Design a protein around this ligand. Structure first.
Ligand SMILES: [Fe+3]
Ligand SMILES: [Fe+3]
Lengths: 73, 74
């Protein structure tokens, strides 16, 4: 719901947003699943980045640079 | 950056979100541009969908499958 618990994939050519109220069909994640509670083997359904490539939409994390393994910035 | 202002590409296997606070670097859209004010010819930077394939993350239109020139998903 709120931008604070939505997370955007930061790789350079992506832009998927994980929405907890939607879940994630391609990753078999049911609606209501918080970003923290995602499996450890979960990847971005678009670009397949790990969750280290994601950033909350607003609030403190949203201005930090994520510890991401694929190209970003 | 409220969800009613964010727009999700519903093309099959896409899901890029236009966040008006970000703008769109590939589209050369400066930050602060509302989705409603995007250029006529503006397209999804990932899948080339027109704006008619997008829907807001909340509010009227957020629940229905967009109808456009690409195959879309619900
Ligand atoms: Fe991604
Ligand atoms: Fe798209």
């Amino acid at each position: 719901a709120n931008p604070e618990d939505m997370w955007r994939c930061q790789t350079v050519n992506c832009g998927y947003v994980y929405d907890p109220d939607r879940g994630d069909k391609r990753g078999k994640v049911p609606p209501g699943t918080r970003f923290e509670d995602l499996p450890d083997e979960w990847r971005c359904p678009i670009c397949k980045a790990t969750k280290k490539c994601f950033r909350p939409l607003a609030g403190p994390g949203s201005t930090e640079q994520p510890q991401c393994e694929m190209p970003t910035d």
